[PDB]
């Protein structure tokens, strides 16, 4: 695979808004995130659509593609980071400068809607991109949870690439929709003990592919959707969906023979899942859809819309140990 | 194509709930729909999940598939009609009895989420199915709009298959969210603002349905292949402009706009333009990035009332100069 140079303290991070204009609509959280990374010693380059709005998005399809491409063209930038998601990143894909991305590999990072870019770029270039922090939701989060997110971000992106990396497990997490865009918290978020579950036994090792599952529907079937292959580990998360929607997306995967190919599934914690009074969790729905197909599942990985959030390279091998209840990166993912 | 026998007054219609359990949650409107069709002379057979609930759905995946299959097996039924949509019809697809459908073709009709079944059945069997009335939303509608819906339903499904059929244009329509399952007053009525963007005449096989729903079968063996020359028919309901851009770009990435000869946009019920004042056609235009595809914007085959009935998988001719749309290929035996 094509690998970017590793991150280091003092590097320059460029940010872009490929969908929702949250540098305007969540400006307090944006400023908090900017200050957080600056105090860690990073230099920031603001994408050209920062501070702009086109109603539901930051700019036209072409303006958004231009904003991203301009960061790729900047030799001083080591990391290109999403400000926030939305719905509309998939629009950009015909207009990204893939040749320039190949010529100038950088760490591309974000989550949620930005999945369209992470997966699309991998499909076109083979670049290992990252499911991880977006500036506003991730680094604008109030303490204490933001520090745990940051610890994973800096560890994954700066560590020496020798030997496997085994993920730490956040001690507590939350998914509450409070404390979004103000100077002070209303009150502390509920902190839950980590209830991640490892359904299966033994160890499964395979290339991880996926991201935000609802977002994948916007690139599905196209040359920008990476082919899923026998032995892959499927990584999927969603946010604030109804159980009806979750069944639909799981069945979509089933119809596409995904569950005939993959050797394990990682479900990211689902932020504020709406079970419609059924008390069912997404794993129970997945089990019905699987119709007896036995696939080991890591239910509740902290790489999703919940806080804190871990950083995950996409398109390289991971090993899930279902007996020892851990998950590791086993393949080099930065130069 | 595989063709079902035409409907006749007095026939038996069977109904099924492949997703939302609205025979329970919209029981008043359900009863209105049943009574409406019975008054027309139809006999109704209730699918086995009628009156059942499993929270957000009518029953398990397998039970819903069985409900549908049992209607296929019933020799007295000539038309299998959806009660209502939802989100979850795509789950049934591995379990439908496609061989039984081939052995005894029937009129299968519905819309919205039921698109997964209409498209899936066509992909597997070649059966010409219908984007049209579902029992609860369509036939539980109060007069006067329900009468225009019914006129299209009965005309399309009972007419002799001789010569082209040219659609009537409803004089007025509504998308107002009142009088669902309760009336205090009639819905607000709007003049028909359907628009024909293009020139000349385009003829090609129509394919599509509810666009959001298509995402749940996309890429699979149940998604019919879109071919050079097809007319793409798509409608959505109560979506944000952000979602509409996403779905249009999905089509673009899949090279759909390199294949289609025209696009039909169904009227979008209560579209949320996020203050932009933009309509879906304008968003489509941006996404098309210069591609000159003629568009019929605002066809009355969607979640708005009244609703026309449309066979999927047969040739239509859109005459952009004369501002009309016709079915040009035989669609019932």
XYZ file of C-alpha atoms in Angstrom:
668
model
C 0.000 0.000 0.000
C 0.865 3.672 -0.437
C 1.977 5.166 2.888
C 2.106 8.744 4.152
C 4.965 10.189 6.208
C 4.346 9.906 9.973
C 3.145 12.827 12.078
C 5.416 14.633 14.533
C 4.987 17.274 17.210
C 5.130 20.710 15.581
C 3.832 19.571 12.193
C 1.311 21.501 10.096
C -2.264 20.228 9.886
C -4.585 21.568 7.189
C -8.346 21.342 7.638
C -11.241 21.242 5.151
C -15.045 21.281 5.223
C -16.304 18.766 2.655
C -19.923 18.968 3.805
C -21.543 20.832 6.713
C -20.285 24.395 7.319
C -19.580 23.872 11.029
C -16.732 26.398 11.210
C -19.672 28.821 11.105
C -22.533 26.861 12.661
C -20.458 25.405 15.521
C -17.953 28.231 15.744
C -17.399 28.042 19.522
C -16.542 24.336 19.369
C -14.395 25.012 16.299
C -12.385 27.651 18.159
C -11.958 25.303 21.115
C -10.651 22.571 18.802
C -8.241 24.945 17.073
C -6.892 26.141 20.429
C -6.557 22.554 21.673
C -4.341 21.501 18.757
C -2.363 24.764 18.782
C -1.522 24.260 22.459
C -0.159 20.808 21.543
C 2.240 22.618 19.225
C 0.603 22.051 15.839
C 0.511 24.719 13.154
C -2.876 24.962 11.450
C -3.746 25.833 7.874
C -7.398 26.770 7.368
C -9.049 25.471 4.207
C -10.419 28.131 1.861
C -14.065 27.451 2.795
C -13.519 28.137 6.491
C -16.039 30.735 7.652
C -18.276 30.314 4.588
C -21.794 28.953 4.209
C -23.968 27.759 1.350
C -26.964 26.903 3.526
C -26.564 23.166 4.275
C -22.989 22.902 2.978
C -19.732 24.894 2.914
C -19.782 25.568 -0.832
C -20.515 24.103 -4.239
C -19.335 20.613 -5.152
C -16.435 22.070 -7.123
C -15.533 24.622 -4.432
C -15.301 21.805 -1.889
C -13.127 19.671 -4.168
C -10.880 22.708 -4.752
C -10.556 23.319 -1.008
C -9.347 19.764 -0.473
C -7.039 19.726 -3.503
C -5.345 22.946 -2.379
C -4.330 21.274 0.888
C -2.885 18.344 -1.067
C -0.809 20.837 -3.087
C 0.711 22.429 0.014
C 4.135 20.876 0.677
C 4.161 22.134 4.281
C 1.121 20.078 5.271
C 1.677 16.654 6.866
C -1.936 15.950 7.823
C -5.218 16.853 6.132
C -8.037 16.766 8.676
C -11.797 17.015 8.251
C -13.538 19.763 10.241
C -16.803 17.771 10.483
C -19.037 15.468 8.458
C -22.523 15.985 7.083
C -23.967 14.264 4.017
C -22.220 15.504 0.906
C -18.560 14.442 0.684
C -19.371 11.826 -1.961
C -20.099 14.640 -4.429
C -16.415 15.584 -4.490
C -15.042 12.280 -5.707
C -14.992 12.931 -9.490
C -13.033 16.151 -8.865
C -10.233 15.196 -6.457
C -6.687 15.321 -7.778
C -5.746 11.673 -7.295
C -2.484 12.015 -9.193
C -1.439 14.775 -6.781
C -2.427 12.613 -3.804
C -0.210 9.832 -5.135
C 2.644 12.281 -5.752
C 2.315 13.893 -2.327
C 0.942 11.344 0.167
C -0.298 12.854 3.420
C -2.218 11.632 6.450
C -5.896 12.032 5.595
C -8.158 11.772 8.618
C -11.798 12.162 9.612
C -14.948 10.110 10.052
C -18.694 9.903 9.460
C -19.633 11.445 6.092
C -15.938 11.868 5.337
C -15.881 8.090 4.867
C -16.727 8.790 1.220
C -13.340 10.497 0.792
C -11.346 8.066 2.929
C -12.705 5.048 1.062
C -12.731 6.751 -2.338
C -9.134 7.888 -2.027
C -8.060 4.393 -0.951
C -9.928 2.897 -3.920
C -8.243 5.216 -6.430
C -4.724 5.423 -4.978
C -4.133 2.670 -2.424
C -3.255 5.309 0.173
C -3.763 4.235 3.758
C -6.138 6.823 5.246
C -7.462 7.110 8.795
C -10.812 6.764 10.520
C -10.340 9.199 13.354
C -10.704 12.714 14.734
C -12.379 15.550 12.914
C -11.368 18.940 14.271
C -14.740 20.209 15.531
C -16.537 17.196 17.036
C -13.393 15.410 18.193
C -11.030 18.097 19.406
C -13.723 20.581 20.409
C -15.033 18.034 22.939
C -14.663 19.244 26.534
C -12.324 17.482 28.941
C -12.011 14.829 30.183
C -12.834 12.805 27.096
C -10.906 14.876 24.547
C -7.611 13.949 26.213
C -8.248 10.249 25.599
C -9.097 10.912 21.954
C -5.904 12.904 21.595
C -3.768 10.238 23.255
C -4.851 7.704 20.625
C -4.422 10.213 17.765
C -0.866 11.115 18.716
C 0.145 7.533 19.601
C -1.096 5.995 16.357
C 0.304 8.713 14.090
C 3.707 9.291 15.733
C 4.742 5.850 17.048
C 7.610 3.909 15.527
C 6.358 1.319 13.033
C 7.902 -1.743 14.660
C 5.961 -4.685 16.051
C 2.199 -4.849 16.423
C 0.219 -2.080 18.051
C -2.434 -3.195 20.538
C -5.209 -0.694 21.263
C -5.887 0.591 24.737
C -9.492 0.370 25.907
C -11.035 3.632 27.098
C -12.080 3.202 30.726
C -15.222 5.274 30.254
C -17.201 6.642 27.323
C -20.297 8.676 26.528
C -22.712 9.356 23.696
C -24.784 12.135 25.245
C -25.819 14.976 22.951
C -25.032 17.838 25.326
C -22.187 20.342 25.708
C -21.931 20.891 21.965
C -21.208 24.548 21.107
C -20.812 26.741 24.208
C -17.954 28.005 26.337
C -18.959 25.945 29.367
C -20.551 22.550 29.866
C -24.185 22.476 30.960
C -23.305 19.568 33.248
C -20.931 16.602 32.975
C -21.780 13.857 30.512
C -22.820 10.478 31.893
C -19.736 8.278 31.851
C -20.367 4.626 31.047
C -18.096 1.711 31.843
C -16.801 0.161 28.638
C -19.196 -2.595 27.599
C -17.383 -3.737 24.466
C -18.051 -7.436 23.764
C -15.991 -9.999 21.846
C -18.341 -12.555 20.275
C -16.212 -15.433 19.042
C -13.044 -17.327 19.886
C -9.459 -17.496 18.683
C -7.703 -14.843 16.602
C -8.771 -13.366 13.273
C -6.326 -11.353 11.171
C -7.280 -9.547 7.987
C -7.302 -6.261 6.079
C -9.781 -3.831 7.621
C -12.220 -2.045 5.315
C -15.251 0.140 5.904
C -16.196 3.220 7.880
C -19.555 4.891 8.396
C -22.034 2.420 6.962
C -24.809 4.839 6.037
C -22.198 6.951 4.236
C -20.980 3.938 2.240
C -24.377 3.817 0.493
C -23.385 7.030 -1.316
C -20.378 5.430 -3.062
C -21.637 1.853 -3.252
C -21.372 0.131 -6.631
C -18.964 2.760 -7.977
C -15.255 2.741 -8.787
C -14.776 4.641 -5.498
C -16.063 1.802 -3.321
C -13.128 -0.426 -2.346
C -13.734 -4.057 -3.251
C -14.360 -6.216 -0.203
C -12.478 -9.496 -0.420
C -12.438 -12.899 1.215
C -10.772 -12.648 4.607
C -11.266 -8.911 5.147
C -12.399 -7.567 8.495
C -15.423 -5.301 8.031
C -15.421 -2.141 10.148
C -18.727 -0.293 10.384
C -20.248 2.374 12.609
C -23.373 4.506 12.476
C -24.785 7.419 14.483
C -28.265 8.210 15.816
C -30.066 5.762 13.552
C -33.316 3.953 14.147
C -33.323 0.188 14.440
C -35.341 0.222 11.196
C -32.442 1.927 9.397
C -29.861 -0.372 10.980
C -31.744 -3.478 9.789
C -31.888 -1.970 6.288
C -28.134 -1.305 6.169
C -27.235 -4.744 7.551
C -29.495 -6.390 4.983
C -27.855 -4.299 2.251
C -24.506 -5.845 3.230
C -26.113 -9.302 3.263
C -27.559 -8.866 -0.233
C -24.113 -7.803 -1.457
C -22.574 -11.085 -0.222
C -20.372 -9.207 2.233
C -21.097 -11.767 4.954
C -19.930 -14.566 2.648
C -16.500 -12.894 2.433
C -15.492 -11.287 5.704
C -13.727 -13.122 8.513
C -14.841 -10.789 11.303
C -16.947 -7.677 11.856
C -16.120 -4.689 14.059
C -19.128 -2.653 15.159
C -18.244 0.804 16.414
C -20.339 1.961 19.358
C -23.574 3.402 17.945
C -24.251 6.915 19.254
C -27.762 7.181 20.751
C -29.190 4.197 18.874
C -32.989 4.378 18.705
C -34.304 0.857 19.327
C -37.955 1.937 18.984
C -38.880 0.520 22.379
C -37.742 -2.982 21.412
C -34.733 -2.905 23.769
C -32.733 -4.634 21.013
C -29.126 -3.715 20.286
C -27.549 -3.600 16.829
C -25.761 -6.926 17.382
C -29.117 -8.662 17.851
C -30.318 -7.226 14.536
C -27.096 -8.290 12.809
C -27.591 -11.796 14.185
C -31.056 -12.056 12.640
C -29.772 -10.782 9.307
C -26.856 -13.241 9.344
C -29.347 -16.125 9.261
C -26.996 -18.618 10.902
C -23.769 -17.461 9.253
C -21.175 -17.602 12.014
C -18.893 -14.578 11.967
C -17.017 -13.368 15.036
C -17.917 -9.815 16.004
C -16.210 -7.154 18.097
C -19.257 -5.257 19.295
C -18.476 -1.801 20.649
C -15.104 -0.631 19.340
C -14.422 2.974 20.399
C -13.973 4.321 16.890
C -17.222 6.041 16.007
C -19.339 9.027 17.014
C -19.041 8.213 20.737
C -16.407 9.887 22.934
C -13.583 9.255 23.277
C -12.551 8.116 19.839
C -9.563 6.011 18.761
C -7.647 6.463 15.497
C -7.793 3.551 13.023
C -5.849 3.082 9.780
C -8.080 1.709 7.015
C -6.894 -0.867 4.488
C -4.205 -2.604 6.535
C -4.233 -5.831 8.528
C -5.601 -5.944 12.058
C -5.706 -8.914 14.413
C -8.667 -9.322 16.765
C -7.984 -11.711 19.647
C -11.424 -12.863 20.774
C -9.988 -14.948 23.600
C -7.823 -12.205 25.087
C -10.332 -9.497 24.154
C -7.996 -7.170 22.305
C -7.404 -5.668 18.869
C -4.085 -4.848 17.192
C -2.689 -3.284 14.028
C -0.293 -5.808 12.481
C 0.730 -4.133 9.202
C 2.803 -0.991 8.620
C 0.512 2.001 7.979
C 2.909 4.982 7.814
C 6.399 5.408 6.365
C -40.762 -9.609 -20.192
C -42.940 -11.727 -17.916
C -46.477 -10.319 -17.819
C -49.278 -10.719 -15.289
C -52.940 -11.033 -16.252
C -54.920 -7.775 -16.250
C -57.038 -6.825 -13.259
C -60.815 -6.990 -13.453
C -63.446 -5.523 -11.152
C -64.495 -8.253 -8.742
C -61.020 -9.791 -8.572
C -59.360 -10.725 -5.287
C -56.604 -8.440 -4.007
C -54.237 -9.707 -1.299
C -52.303 -7.288 0.897
C -49.050 -7.633 2.852
C -46.984 -5.561 5.313
C -43.327 -5.975 4.379
C -42.142 -3.227 6.750
C -44.097 -0.823 8.988
C -47.062 -2.341 10.872
C -49.558 0.331 9.784
C -52.588 -1.977 9.851
C -52.186 -1.397 13.601
C -50.594 2.056 13.851
C -52.831 3.650 11.195
C -55.862 1.450 11.740
C -58.434 4.125 10.904
C -56.826 4.861 7.544
C -56.377 1.128 6.915
C -60.104 0.521 7.412
C -60.927 3.410 5.061
C -58.735 1.826 2.386
C -60.286 -1.603 2.808
C -63.792 -0.164 2.651
C -62.930 1.947 -0.403
C -61.763 -1.052 -2.444
C -64.567 -3.319 -1.230
C -67.101 -0.695 -2.363
C -65.539 -0.849 -5.842
C -66.342 -4.567 -5.931
C -63.010 -6.105 -4.967
C -62.567 -8.982 -2.564
C -59.679 -8.499 -0.144
C -57.466 -11.133 1.424
C -55.464 -9.987 4.434
C -51.851 -11.120 4.723
C -51.038 -13.110 7.857
C -49.230 -10.209 9.553
C -52.262 -7.923 9.401
C -52.962 -6.705 12.942
C -49.544 -7.763 14.231
C -46.712 -5.600 15.546
C -43.044 -6.139 16.256
C -42.259 -2.603 17.358
C -40.946 -0.932 14.179
C -41.960 -3.719 11.805
C -44.781 -6.209 11.216
C -42.714 -9.275 12.093
C -39.415 -11.094 11.629
C -37.619 -11.078 8.287
C -38.664 -14.653 7.628
C -42.276 -14.125 8.707
C -42.629 -11.153 6.356
C -41.205 -13.183 3.485
C -43.704 -15.942 4.298
C -46.568 -13.428 4.360
C -45.745 -12.346 0.818
C -45.068 -15.847 -0.484
C -48.412 -17.103 0.823
C -50.207 -14.493 -1.286
C -48.268 -15.690 -4.330
C -49.409 -19.262 -3.620
C -53.086 -18.260 -3.368
C -54.711 -19.097 -6.725
C -57.621 -16.687 -6.210
C -55.400 -13.610 -5.904
C -54.751 -11.576 -9.047
C -53.134 -8.562 -7.391
C -50.712 -8.417 -4.456
C -50.718 -4.938 -2.906
C -48.487 -3.411 -0.242
C -50.267 -1.981 2.813
C -47.561 0.666 3.361
C -43.793 1.106 3.178
C -41.261 1.718 5.916
C -37.575 0.811 5.773
C -37.187 -2.946 5.818
C -38.516 -4.636 2.663
C -34.991 -5.279 1.388
C -34.497 -7.834 4.183
C -37.027 -10.156 2.539
C -35.191 -10.513 -0.742
C -33.174 -13.696 -0.047
C -36.383 -15.427 1.017
C -38.989 -14.562 -1.614
C -40.226 -17.426 -3.756
C -39.136 -16.141 -7.170
C -39.812 -19.484 -8.816
C -43.425 -19.361 -7.619
C -43.749 -15.819 -8.968
C -42.522 -16.997 -12.370
C -44.941 -19.939 -12.278
C -47.953 -17.721 -11.513
C -47.335 -14.090 -12.371
C -49.621 -11.597 -10.637
C -49.869 -7.816 -10.427
C -47.509 -6.712 -7.653
C -48.002 -3.090 -6.647
C -46.771 -0.599 -4.067
C -44.265 2.205 -3.663
C -41.662 3.808 -1.399
C -39.792 1.179 0.648
C -41.600 -1.525 -1.327
C -39.358 -0.483 -4.225
C -36.901 -3.053 -2.865
C -39.393 -5.816 -3.675
C -40.563 -4.370 -6.998
C -36.972 -3.995 -8.230
C -35.788 -7.269 -6.690
C -38.609 -9.279 -8.212
C -37.952 -7.721 -11.620
C -34.225 -8.459 -11.341
C -34.878 -12.121 -10.543
C -37.878 -12.896 -12.738
C -38.394 -10.249 -15.402
C -41.914 -9.644 -14.097
C -43.382 -6.249 -14.912
C -44.427 -4.861 -11.509
C -46.063 -1.547 -10.696
C -45.085 1.617 -8.896
C -48.462 2.585 -7.568
C -51.001 2.582 -4.752
C -50.407 0.991 -1.375
C -53.610 0.219 0.517
C -53.184 2.517 3.523
C -51.567 5.719 2.232
C -53.154 5.596 -1.211
C -56.660 4.226 -0.762
C -57.176 5.472 2.792
C -56.793 9.015 1.437
C -60.003 11.075 1.682
C -61.897 12.190 -1.404
C -61.456 13.953 -3.658
C -57.826 12.986 -4.231
C -58.322 9.250 -3.674
C -60.719 9.197 -6.626
C -58.056 10.448 -9.044
C -55.600 7.880 -7.691
C -58.163 5.148 -8.215
C -58.987 6.304 -11.737
C -55.348 5.800 -12.760
C -55.061 2.467 -10.932
C -58.131 0.997 -12.616
C -57.356 2.467 -16.070
C -53.774 1.196 -16.198
C -54.571 -2.251 -14.805
C -57.785 -3.002 -16.730
C -57.362 -1.338 -20.147
C -56.973 -3.316 -23.355
C -53.333 -3.619 -24.372
C -53.771 -1.946 -27.745
C -51.904 1.185 -28.796
C -49.916 3.479 -26.530
C -51.375 4.779 -23.292
C -50.921 8.509 -22.662
C -51.160 9.652 -19.046
C -53.648 12.190 -17.846
C -52.263 15.049 -15.770
C -53.924 15.606 -12.398
C -55.392 19.105 -12.336
C -54.493 19.614 -8.688
C -52.322 17.876 -6.089
C -51.220 18.122 -2.468
C -48.457 17.072 -0.127
C -50.022 18.577 3.001
C -49.492 16.480 6.120
C -53.028 16.462 7.522
C -55.924 13.994 7.680
C -53.652 10.969 8.053
C -55.214 8.623 10.622
C -57.841 10.885 12.207
C -61.532 15.776 9.052
C -61.515 19.463 9.965
C -60.821 20.633 6.418
C -59.741 19.547 2.915
C -56.042 19.521 2.064
C -54.613 22.617 0.418
C -54.591 22.074 -3.352
C -51.873 23.232 -5.746
C -52.008 23.686 -9.492
C -49.908 21.085 -11.258
C -46.433 22.542 -11.771
C -44.940 19.568 -13.599
C -42.266 20.728 -16.058
C -40.732 19.193 -19.186
C -37.086 20.189 -19.537
C -35.894 19.152 -22.973
C -36.992 18.808 -26.574
C -38.068 16.081 -28.961
C -39.229 12.640 -27.910
C -37.368 10.081 -25.797
C -38.394 6.425 -25.669
C -36.779 3.827 -23.437
C -37.285 1.195 -20.747
C -38.276 2.806 -17.443
C -36.415 1.669 -14.330
C -36.195 2.894 -10.752
C -38.594 3.822 -7.972
C -37.902 5.321 -4.551
C -34.279 6.459 -4.770
C -33.425 6.302 -1.068
C -34.801 2.760 -0.974
C -32.619 1.700 -3.922
C -29.565 2.218 -1.690
C -30.591 -0.886 0.260
C -30.303 -3.204 -2.753
C -27.622 -1.382 -4.734
C -24.697 -3.471 -5.936
C -26.557 -6.754 -5.363
C -28.092 -9.294 -7.692
C -31.477 -7.801 -6.758
C -30.691 -4.396 -8.260
C -31.743 -4.447 -11.916
C -28.906 -3.396 -14.209
C -29.416 0.084 -15.647
C -28.728 -0.075 -19.388
C -27.937 2.348 -22.196
C -31.184 4.028 -23.219
C -33.173 3.506 -20.024
C -35.387 6.207 -18.619
C -34.590 6.629 -14.920
C -37.646 7.112 -12.713
C -36.909 8.316 -9.182
C -38.919 9.816 -6.329
C -38.199 10.594 -2.693
C -40.227 11.841 0.289
C -39.579 14.309 3.116
C -35.841 14.451 2.506
C -33.407 17.265 3.135
C -31.616 18.903 0.233
C -28.416 17.464 1.728
C -29.766 13.925 1.325
C -31.020 14.662 -2.192
C -27.568 15.868 -3.282
C -26.035 12.729 -1.762
C -28.389 10.398 -3.642
C -27.954 12.235 -6.949
C -24.171 12.092 -6.591
C -24.405 8.373 -5.818
C -26.044 7.913 -9.227
C -23.378 10.068 -10.847
C -20.532 8.056 -9.319
C -22.189 4.889 -10.628
C -22.113 6.282 -14.182
C -25.914 6.210 -14.359
C -26.060 9.588 -16.084
C -23.851 8.241 -18.886
C -26.536 5.631 -19.697
C -29.960 7.164 -19.245
C -31.889 8.842 -22.084
C -34.129 10.835 -19.734
C -34.953 11.207 -16.033
C -38.391 11.382 -14.447
C -38.475 13.076 -11.040
C -41.606 12.299 -9.052
C -42.961 15.207 -7.016
C -41.016 15.286 -3.732
C -43.384 15.336 -0.736
C -42.491 18.159 1.673
C -38.909 18.597 0.442
C -36.730 20.435 2.973
C -34.544 22.893 1.041
C -32.795 24.151 4.205
C -33.671 27.778 3.440
C -31.906 27.692 0.075
C -35.172 27.907 -1.925
C -33.605 25.364 -4.286
C -35.648 22.547 -5.787
C -34.363 19.048 -6.509
C -34.022 19.782 -10.250
C -31.522 22.554 -9.505
C -29.447 20.159 -7.380
C -29.587 17.554 -10.134
C -28.358 20.186 -12.593
C -25.298 20.917 -10.454
C -24.530 17.218 -10.066
C -24.917 16.600 -13.828
C -22.026 19.016 -14.471
C -23.163 19.885 -17.980
C -24.659 16.575 -19.098
C -27.699 17.404 -21.232
C -30.285 14.926 -20.002
C -33.950 15.756 -20.555
C -35.962 15.724 -17.341
C -39.656 15.416 -16.584
C -39.769 17.225 -13.247
C -42.836 16.614 -11.099
C -44.467 13.433 -12.371
C -47.434 12.474 -10.175
C -46.144 9.051 -9.165
C -44.721 9.522 -5.699
C -45.797 10.271 -2.123
C -47.904 13.253 -3.200
C -51.664 12.903 -3.814
C -53.099 11.893 -6.173
C -50.821 9.127 -7.401
C -50.667 7.576 -10.883
C -49.857 3.896 -11.522
C -46.659 3.139 -13.500
C -45.410 -0.198 -14.873
C -41.684 -0.668 -14.280
C -39.434 -2.351 -16.813
C -41.265 -1.471 -20.031
C -40.803 1.283 -22.600
C -42.233 4.737 -22.077
C -42.156 7.664 -24.490
C -41.748 11.162 -23.092
C -42.692 13.803 -25.639
C -40.991 16.946 -24.379
C -42.383 19.080 -27.192
C -46.001 18.068 -26.606
C -45.515 17.777 -22.834
C -46.829 14.249 -22.378
C -45.750 10.799 -21.250
C -46.969 7.444 -22.578
C -46.537 3.709 -22.061
C -45.540 2.198 -25.404
C -44.834 -1.464 -24.555
C -47.310 -4.172 -23.507
C -47.240 -4.579 -19.718
C -50.062 -7.052 -18.953
C -50.889 -10.316 -20.731
